[PDB]
């Protein structure tokens, strides 16, 4: 008669690593790394991402004519922009402090577009011939929809003196621009006056732009340039424009209704017609694991990203042959 | 392993013991069988659960990357930003893999320790009333029926009786 | 007869955590985290902090009239500035490269103020009517004390050509400004000349400012703006001013006598009439602990900051019921 | 614990032993009492002291935050700066809590190991001259006065004599 | 050490055993000598090799500094950049020194564990056929020639024979 | 008769540290920290570093006359620049976006210099009197070799209108500059016209510089300043210059033939006439160790830098007295 002390064994093949020995087979273990994703951009907490598709934050916000899909876009969870969106600045130029603006959007979930200066209101200037072949809509030369490219009327550009007071409770994102002409003849032709300026002023802002003339390679069929500027107009503050030429005026400016968690995700992917609690630029994630290795940039309630291929914890003991 | 029991003087595990991690196998005139030791087993389940949770929670607060964009003449800070993000991922990846490696090793030895301690616990009861076979078994000098076997698992083996 | 081996027990309730078990009671332990502070801003190594109170680094350095407390301030250990100090730029404007300057101050413990251009010396210009209602002292319109707001005399602003040579052994912090007028009439009224400039030059500096005119919301009762610039004039270098209007000239400039460890701490707190070897924005620290969790930004010989609520090391063994 | 002594085969500590961490309790015709083993105790005090100092010193050089300020159109770098500072605090917080957790566990097992080793040390002297009771005690086959008890604590127990 | 063998009940190492880390020393009528136990030794060499490689590889991916330059009015970012680089060096320096400290301690105890396990392995064969001296030695009740000694190192010591 | 179990000892003095005990002597151990270097700058993978010696990236790229060694320099592995190279901007000034350019060089291994605008070609302007005493070559006043300092001919500076098209497959680094004169008389004297400008344009670039006049401390015997600008001209893009004075024109521009891993190392050291697989600013490294503590900034296949003085792993056991 005898009694023995022993321990559990089973048919498990699961292996764990230790410091002194690799691929040790154990009776029980626990994987803690999420290795899979659905492969799709998805709604986040039921809330649809703003997907720009071929358009870019610039295309959208200036109102590129081929970004018509994105007028009055609803509240978004996050934004998705391609690496090289084709429909950007259709009329070549620059967007001043673009990255600082994009960064501002990571704090924003919804814009409400409103008209601050009506196109009709430009009685002493021509407001409807301000277009180019570079930004084309429906086969016809058009232009960034949210800003008016003002030109001279009966050979005269009288000084513009305009002022908008933000009576809304919100911060207002105001956009405008300056046009840089190819040559002196082009300047006089478009605006009559040879020496021009745009003074913009708020409680903080103290701007005065002048057009830089230079000979430039055609981009999108034009050698002329448009430099775009922005500000946040606080509530109960007023913005003051004054110019005698080369002024691209605001028509509509965006109201900032919801601030909160958001992100500009960078992906070539399109909408998946799905929903998730955790999204990555490669696809969405659904797991209880504490870790994953899909992609570092995520949004939502997610496991922690690690570069590991394998994370497996021993729970059971060393399993026998 | 560190404690010498698992895959040691006890050469192998038991496919026949499914009710626990550690236990006893008896054999006498009336038959033989496996019986899990609940106390040591439950102790182990608690130890390892807490461990897994402890590991999960320590990693809870860890670096998170954000999208930040830089124009063509901000290459230095773009680079700085990339290195910073990469740097933290590397640090936290290392933390995770090391922890798993180190604790995995501790977990196996923990099980080994529990088997040995259980063995010693039994050894210390039987004393000179049984032969230590060298393999995890004790061969009794007296007949030991199921009542007798039960008293060994009990902690109750009456040494002065036998 | 028998001999037993055993171990110590005691009435201790101290508990420590391990990986597999929490709240384990041990005979002895050692807390290594400092959880308390006195709650006061304190002298550091006996050396008083410079406390700006309601004034700001700008208010102080330009010499805002309501920052009179802070003329010729003595050597400081560290500086304390509120989050939203009321007495900042009394006359609205900007302070150019302000953050880079504030950063410079983290390396400075003492300024010695000296006069480089006497107010008396402006014989061909009016130097004593350069004030505004926005910066008021004792019920009377005053101005930033360290710089002179020069205006025209008998309807004429002759070109200013002035030069200071740094014969001191030290680096000199020189401050000056440009004034931006509301309108063309305001420009002519104040300075006569319509087109103006300020050329500043040192061995490194090559500046030339022009006033930007724009219509701006009143701030502190004025729509006009003052933009302030600075440089470090090296020893044996000279600075050269030249202007025909809108020039806010240096009166006094600060000598940098002591460089060393310092910091701009951000706190609402006031002076505690105490002393310490380690200071935080929430209060001072006195302990032998290797760690604390009071606040990350500290100055002095301090323990290392951690976000932990509890750090307790077992020294003794597992204590028995 | 890993070594099976503390709260193991030795069920509980002794409120009556104040002169050390580990020691002996004797009982014979002439009375009973506690006596700390200085050697093992001092070894433990040295081990743990060094540990605490080793921990304090490794943490000595660790990240320190500085105040840096950024205007309204430097939000990206302000954010970058914040993440960098937060990132390091999180890393060093984790380092500290893990170290404490891991070493705390090592400290308890260290004490357990010292108790067991002391027990084995005594066991190996007495050999078959005393009964191993199963609880940390040895019951002698011969009368063992204070001289005799002293020789066991000495390391000097003359086995061929008894 | 944790396991009580090295510099413990076995007081010191053997300059005379050069063929391995652990082994046996025999002495009988026909002479005496050292013999390394290959199995335990090789196990140790594998354990420690893997350890060293495991340590080297985990540190493989670690922060790398780059030269980045900043003009006279970019002092904030210059400083930020310096802190970032310094911060990671400190973190990785700490990781390296701790790992070495912790694993060094584990390595010594590992060797101690292997010596003890080998000792127990022998003890469990001999059983009551030899006296446990208290110092790592077993004194036989029967004459034990080189054949007999060999069977102990074999694992083959025929207990029912003697 | 007896058999004993024991363990190895030997005459080793090697010591390792643990958490509870320091300086423990072990039978065997393994040092993993590389503590030595050869003390020399070395070829990297057989490929020579570009060593500027007393010259600086600026001196080299503008073609300072005393940096003649570095015309048409061959492919380099890495670049070595001193902390305070004497032969920098010989004619005082600034180099615009210098650090962003230096950063660009960390991605470049070879430039191939080519002439885009011949010096001969400036028929309507004087191109050979554009020199200064500050940049002296062979006892005679010379100038930055890669750019032409154009001045007026027969008292007239006619508008320059020049254009280069990048027909090469490569990106081209183009360099140019503007000259800031001391005074109005100096401006007219050098260039005739009083109000001048330089418009530069590519597909992206839209520059227009004007000279800032100010009184400046002499540096290198001159109070006048030269501000230098650059761009990367893409293949099949054209650059367009236009100026009526103060224009420092490109003569030669650098072709970017090899892009790849490189670095600007900062060392006072000179060439060692040696070769290595891993280089530091203090000397080269040759070891199999996983770590070293020589210097953080390295280039090549190197061990990982740590601040440790000692890293030694126990392999053997605790060695006996
Ligand atoms: C080699 C040659 O002779 N080519 C001309 C060719 O230039 C010319 O086309 C016109 O060229 C001008 C400038 O040279 C503009 O590029 C014209 O394009 C437009 C545009 O679409 O943007 C026309 C548009 O109506 C204009 N709109 C406004 C508000 O002005 C704009 C605008 O003026 C400029 O873009 C401002 O920079 O320009 C383009 O049609 C043709 C026909 O004139 O003849 C060729 O021979
Ligand atoms: C609706 C209306 O008619 N309002 C005027 C009101 O403007 C005017 O007050 C004066 O307004 C001017 C500009 O419009 C300045 O704001 C005057 O303030 C001062 C100031 O305190 O700063 C007066 C001061 O003496 C001036 N100092 C100097 C050195 O010039 C400054 C200075 O000129 C400007 O600030 C430069 O931008 O302005 C303010 O008194 C009153 C009385 O004139 O009449 C109202 O009807
Ligand atoms: C106190 C006094 O009278 N001193 C003058 C002294 O200035 C003058 O020397 C000339 O001074 C001028 C400006 O004042 C330049 O510094 C001359 O130097 C050069 C130079 O070497 O750079 C001469 C050179 O030939 C010029 N080259 C060109 C292309 O113009 C340049 C250039 O004009 C300026 O550098 C542009 O800023 O200047 C220097 O010889 C002497 C002799 O004239 O008389 C002293 O009394
Ligand atoms: C442990 O097991 C892993 C996975 O089963 C082994 O990984 C393979 O390694 C071999 C060569 O070493 C390759 O042919 C396979 O492609 C690997 N697959 C992997 C890593 O997923 C690994 O070799 C084993 N490691 C050790 C030390 O034995
Ligand atoms: C923009 O408009 C608002 C209201 O239309 C202005 O705020 C009022 O301004 C008046 C005018 O002097 C004051 O009497 C009131 O006290 C203010 N009331 C409210 C509700 O705001 C505001 O000042 C205007 N902004 C600017 C910059 O002129
Ligand atoms: C260990 O002890 C701590 C502190 O005594 C316990 O903390 C309390 O937790 C309960 C709920 O779990 C709360 O009601 C208290 O507010 C907590 N106070 C604290 C954390 O200071 C903790 O619950 C115990 N942990 C375990 C695992 O038993
Ligand atoms: C500022 O003043 C100092 C001394 O007053 C100047 O330094 C001297 O300059 C003279 C003038 O040519 C030289 O002869 C001396 O060799 C210098 N001596 C000393 C002690 O500095 C200095 O050059 C002046 N600075 C400028 C930029 O003109
Ligand atoms: C362990 O050994 C080291 C190196 O042999 C000792 O280091 C020396 O320390 C003493 C004072 O403590 C100094 O005089 C020497 O200059 C040190 N040399 C070094 C560090 O290289 C160290 O003291 C020993 N440490 C302990 C805890 O015993
Ligand atoms: C620079 O030159 C190249 C070729 O010399 C130009 O590219 C060609 O441009 C012509 C002119 O209209 C086109 O017909 C061809 O399709 C292009 N061919 C090639 C091979 O490039 C280039 O456009 C010129 N760049 C600029 C900005 O004018
Ligand atoms: C463990 O088992 C022993 C023997 O198998 C138990 O003793 C018996 O208990 C049963 C059930 O109560 C009684 O009917 C018998 O009279 C007892 N026989 C003997 C030989 O003891 C004992 O109760 C158990 N002990 C524990 C702690 O569970
Ligand atoms: C430990 O104790 C033993 C016995 O208690 C000691 O032996 C006695 O020592 C005393 C004091 O020197 C002598 O007077 C006696 O003659 C000894 N009696 C016996 C029975 O040995 C012994 O000296 C001690 N050993 C050590 C190492 O301290
Ligand atoms: C280990 O050694 C034992 C005894 O030393 C071996 O037994 C002998 O083996 C030799 C060689 O084959 C034979 O010639 C003898 O007849 C055997 N004698 C005895 C007493 O057994 C045994 O073979 C060895 N066992 C192992 C596993 O190596």
PDB file of C-alpha atoms in Angstrom, chain C residues 164-295:
ATOM      1  CA  UNK C 164      24.403 102.536 -26.941  1.00  0.00           C
ATOM      2  CA  UNK C 165      27.694 100.717 -26.357  1.00  0.00           C
ATOM      3  CA  UNK C 166      27.705  97.981 -23.695  1.00  0.00           C
ATOM      4  CA  UNK C 167      30.830  98.834 -21.694  1.00  0.00           C
ATOM      5  CA  UNK C 168      29.659  96.641 -18.783  1.00  0.00           C
ATOM      6  CA  UNK C 169      31.209  93.184 -18.367  1.00  0.00           C
ATOM      7  CA  UNK C 170      27.687  91.653 -18.505  1.00  0.00           C
ATOM      8  CA  UNK C 171      25.125  90.689 -21.137  1.00  0.00           C
ATOM      9  CA  UNK C 172      22.454  93.377 -21.311  1.00  0.00           C
ATOM     10  CA  UNK C 173      18.767  92.751 -21.889  1.00  0.00           C
ATOM     11  CA  UNK C 174      17.531  95.644 -23.996  1.00  0.00           C
ATOM     12  CA  UNK C 175      13.799  96.201 -24.550  1.00  0.00           C
ATOM     13  CA  UNK C 176      11.985  98.431 -27.067  1.00  0.00           C
ATOM     14  CA  UNK C 177       8.735  98.714 -29.051  1.00  0.00           C
ATOM     15  CA  UNK C 178       6.804  99.949 -32.093  1.00  0.00           C
ATOM     16  CA  UNK C 179       3.381 101.563 -31.961  1.00  0.00           C
ATOM     17  CA  UNK C 180       0.654 100.592 -34.392  1.00  0.00           C
ATOM     18  CA  UNK C 181      -1.822 103.469 -34.884  1.00  0.00           C
ATOM     19  CA  UNK C 182      -5.555 103.079 -35.526  1.00  0.00           C
ATOM     20  CA  UNK C 183      -5.684 105.086 -38.785  1.00  0.00           C
ATOM     21  CA  UNK C 184      -3.720 107.368 -41.153  1.00  0.00           C
ATOM     22  CA  UNK C 185      -4.954 110.490 -39.353  1.00  0.00           C
ATOM     23  CA  UNK C 186      -3.744 109.042 -36.048  1.00  0.00           C
ATOM     24  CA  UNK C 187      -0.309 108.327 -37.540  1.00  0.00           C
ATOM     25  CA  UNK C 188       0.167 111.867 -38.870  1.00  0.00           C
ATOM     26  CA  UNK C 189      -1.271 113.364 -35.686  1.00  0.00           C
ATOM     27  CA  UNK C 190       1.150 111.517 -33.413  1.00  0.00           C
ATOM     28  CA  UNK C 191       4.299 111.460 -35.514  1.00  0.00           C
ATOM     29  CA  UNK C 192       3.658 113.834 -38.467  1.00  0.00           C
ATOM     30  CA  UNK C 193       5.342 111.545 -41.057  1.00  0.00           C
ATOM     31  CA  UNK C 194       3.006 109.053 -42.772  1.00  0.00           C
ATOM     32  CA  UNK C 195       5.541 106.355 -43.755  1.00  0.00           C
ATOM     33  CA  UNK C 196       7.775 105.346 -40.831  1.00  0.00           C
ATOM     34  CA  UNK C 197      10.216 102.672 -39.659  1.00  0.00           C
ATOM     35  CA  UNK C 198      12.523 101.603 -36.829  1.00  0.00           C
ATOM     36  CA  UNK C 199      15.897 100.127 -37.778  1.00  0.00           C
ATOM     37  CA  UNK C 200      17.664  98.346 -34.915  1.00  0.00           C
ATOM     38  CA  UNK C 201      21.142  96.848 -35.307  1.00  0.00           C
ATOM     39  CA  UNK C 202      23.786  95.081 -33.237  1.00  0.00           C
ATOM     40  CA  UNK C 203      26.565  92.714 -34.302  1.00  0.00           C
ATOM     41  CA  UNK C 204      23.905  90.046 -34.863  1.00  0.00           C
ATOM     42  CA  UNK C 205      20.589  91.900 -34.982  1.00  0.00           C
ATOM     43  CA  UNK C 206      19.349  93.295 -38.319  1.00  0.00           C
ATOM     44  CA  UNK C 207      15.825  94.543 -37.626  1.00  0.00           C
ATOM     45  CA  UNK C 208      13.586  97.036 -39.416  1.00  0.00           C
ATOM     46  CA  UNK C 209      10.006  97.356 -38.164  1.00  0.00           C
ATOM     47  CA  UNK C 210       7.153  99.214 -39.857  1.00  0.00           C
ATOM     48  CA  UNK C 211       3.772 100.000 -38.280  1.00  0.00           C
ATOM     49  CA  UNK C 212       0.861  97.840 -39.409  1.00  0.00           C
ATOM     50  CA  UNK C 213      -2.358  99.872 -39.530  1.00  0.00           C
ATOM     51  CA  UNK C 214      -5.674  98.075 -38.976  1.00  0.00           C
ATOM     52  CA  UNK C 215      -9.040  98.559 -37.273  1.00  0.00           C
ATOM     53  CA  UNK C 216      -9.031  96.652 -34.013  1.00  0.00           C
ATOM     54  CA  UNK C 217     -11.425  95.959 -31.171  1.00  0.00           C
ATOM     55  CA  UNK C 218     -10.658  98.147 -28.167  1.00  0.00           C
ATOM     56  CA  UNK C 219      -8.746  96.319 -25.470  1.00  0.00           C
ATOM     57  CA  UNK C 220      -8.384  98.170 -22.160  1.00  0.00           C
ATOM     58  CA  UNK C 221     -10.052 101.143 -23.865  1.00  0.00           C
ATOM     59  CA  UNK C 222      -7.632 101.374 -26.796  1.00  0.00           C
ATOM     60  CA  UNK C 223      -7.673 100.020 -30.349  1.00  0.00           C
ATOM     61  CA  UNK C 224      -3.995 100.915 -30.881  1.00  0.00           C
ATOM     62  CA  UNK C 225      -1.290  98.276 -30.349  1.00  0.00           C
ATOM     63  CA  UNK C 226       2.254  98.086 -28.979  1.00  0.00           C
ATOM     64  CA  UNK C 227       4.549  95.292 -30.162  1.00  0.00           C
ATOM     65  CA  UNK C 228       7.603  94.825 -27.946  1.00  0.00           C
ATOM     66  CA  UNK C 229      10.956  93.370 -28.981  1.00  0.00           C
ATOM     67  CA  UNK C 230      14.119  92.451 -27.149  1.00  0.00           C
ATOM     68  CA  UNK C 231      17.716  91.395 -27.587  1.00  0.00           C
ATOM     69  CA  UNK C 232      20.732  90.403 -25.527  1.00  0.00           C
ATOM     70  CA  UNK C 233      23.442  92.953 -26.170  1.00  0.00           C
ATOM     71  CA  UNK C 234      26.808  91.308 -25.609  1.00  0.00           C
ATOM     72  CA  UNK C 235      29.612  93.118 -23.768  1.00  0.00           C
ATOM     73  CA  UNK C 236      31.553  95.556 -25.969  1.00  0.00           C
ATOM     74  CA  UNK C 237      28.814  95.397 -28.599  1.00  0.00           C
ATOM     75  CA  UNK C 238      26.717  98.434 -29.484  1.00  0.00           C
ATOM     76  CA  UNK C 239      23.022  98.666 -30.365  1.00  0.00           C
ATOM     77  CA  UNK C 240      21.896 101.206 -33.017  1.00  0.00           C
ATOM     78  CA  UNK C 241      18.402 102.675 -33.246  1.00  0.00           C
ATOM     79  CA  UNK C 242      17.079 104.795 -36.095  1.00  0.00           C
ATOM     80  CA  UNK C 243      13.455 105.867 -36.579  1.00  0.00           C
ATOM     81  CA  UNK C 244      11.235 108.612 -38.044  1.00  0.00           C
ATOM     82  CA  UNK C 245       8.109 107.778 -35.989  1.00  0.00           C
ATOM     83  CA  UNK C 246       6.286 105.117 -33.938  1.00  0.00           C
ATOM     84  CA  UNK C 247       9.425 104.410 -31.866  1.00  0.00           C
ATOM     85  CA  UNK C 248       9.115 103.322 -28.243  1.00  0.00           C
ATOM     86  CA  UNK C 249      12.650 103.861 -26.996  1.00  0.00           C
ATOM     87  CA  UNK C 250      14.582 102.140 -24.214  1.00  0.00           C
ATOM     88  CA  UNK C 251      15.048 104.207 -21.046  1.00  0.00           C
ATOM     89  CA  UNK C 252      16.360 101.466 -18.751  1.00  0.00           C
ATOM     90  CA  UNK C 253      17.782  98.073 -19.718  1.00  0.00           C
ATOM     91  CA  UNK C 254      18.498  95.147 -17.391  1.00  0.00           C
ATOM     92  CA  UNK C 255      22.007  93.946 -16.574  1.00  0.00           C
ATOM     93  CA  UNK C 256      22.373  90.176 -16.095  1.00  0.00           C
ATOM     94  CA  UNK C 257      24.567  89.839 -13.019  1.00  0.00           C
ATOM     95  CA  UNK C 258      23.863  86.287 -11.742  1.00  0.00           C
ATOM     96  CA  UNK C 259      23.152  83.342 -14.018  1.00  0.00           C
ATOM     97  CA  UNK C 260      22.193  79.951 -12.599  1.00  0.00           C
ATOM     98  CA  UNK C 261      19.468  77.531 -11.602  1.00  0.00           C
ATOM     99  CA  UNK C 262      16.009  79.064 -11.429  1.00  0.00           C
ATOM    100  CA  UNK C 263      12.454  78.423 -12.661  1.00  0.00           C
ATOM    101  CA  UNK C 264       9.180  80.160 -13.429  1.00  0.00           C
ATOM    102  CA  UNK C 265       6.785  78.373 -11.112  1.00  0.00           C
ATOM    103  CA  UNK C 266       3.067  78.758 -11.813  1.00  0.00           C
ATOM    104  CA  UNK C 267       0.920  79.089  -8.700  1.00  0.00           C
ATOM    105  CA  UNK C 268      -1.950  81.153  -7.322  1.00  0.00           C
ATOM    106  CA  UNK C 269      -0.367  80.894  -3.875  1.00  0.00           C
ATOM    107  CA  UNK C 270       1.227  83.759  -1.976  1.00  0.00           C
ATOM    108  CA  UNK C 271       4.335  83.929   0.249  1.00  0.00           C
ATOM    109  CA  UNK C 272       4.258  81.709   3.361  1.00  0.00           C
ATOM    110  CA  UNK C 273       7.011  83.354   5.441  1.00  0.00           C
ATOM    111  CA  UNK C 274       8.833  80.018   5.626  1.00  0.00           C
ATOM    112  CA  UNK C 275      12.013  78.375   4.325  1.00  0.00           C
ATOM    113  CA  UNK C 276      12.713  75.048   2.565  1.00  0.00           C
ATOM    114  CA  UNK C 277      15.250  72.950   0.626  1.00  0.00           C
ATOM    115  CA  UNK C 278      12.698  71.787  -1.914  1.00  0.00           C
ATOM    116  CA  UNK C 279       9.753  73.717  -3.310  1.00  0.00           C
ATOM    117  CA  UNK C 280       6.675  72.834  -5.335  1.00  0.00           C
ATOM    118  CA  UNK C 281       3.845  75.010  -6.773  1.00  0.00           C
ATOM    119  CA  UNK C 282       1.529  73.534  -4.061  1.00  0.00           C
ATOM    120  CA  UNK C 283       3.846  73.869  -1.055  1.00  0.00           C
ATOM    121  CA  UNK C 284       7.323  72.988   0.222  1.00  0.00           C
ATOM    122  CA  UNK C 285       8.757  69.559   1.038  1.00  0.00           C
ATOM    123  CA  UNK C 286      10.818  68.359   3.967  1.00  0.00           C
ATOM    124  CA  UNK C 287      11.628  64.655   4.055  1.00  0.00           C
ATOM    125  CA  UNK C 288      14.271  61.979   3.796  1.00  0.00           C
ATOM    126  CA  UNK C 289      12.054  59.859   1.502  1.00  0.00           C
ATOM    127  CA  UNK C 290      13.439  58.937  -1.931  1.00  0.00           C
ATOM    128  CA  UNK C 291      10.067  59.646  -3.566  1.00  0.00           C
ATOM    129  CA  UNK C 292       7.110  62.003  -3.302  1.00  0.00           C
ATOM    130  CA  UNK C 293       3.827  62.548  -5.169  1.00  0.00           C
ATOM    131  CA  UNK C 294       3.098  66.223  -4.548  1.00  0.00           C
ATOM    132  CA  UNK C 295       3.700  67.800  -7.965  1.00  0.00           C
TER     133      UNK C 295
END
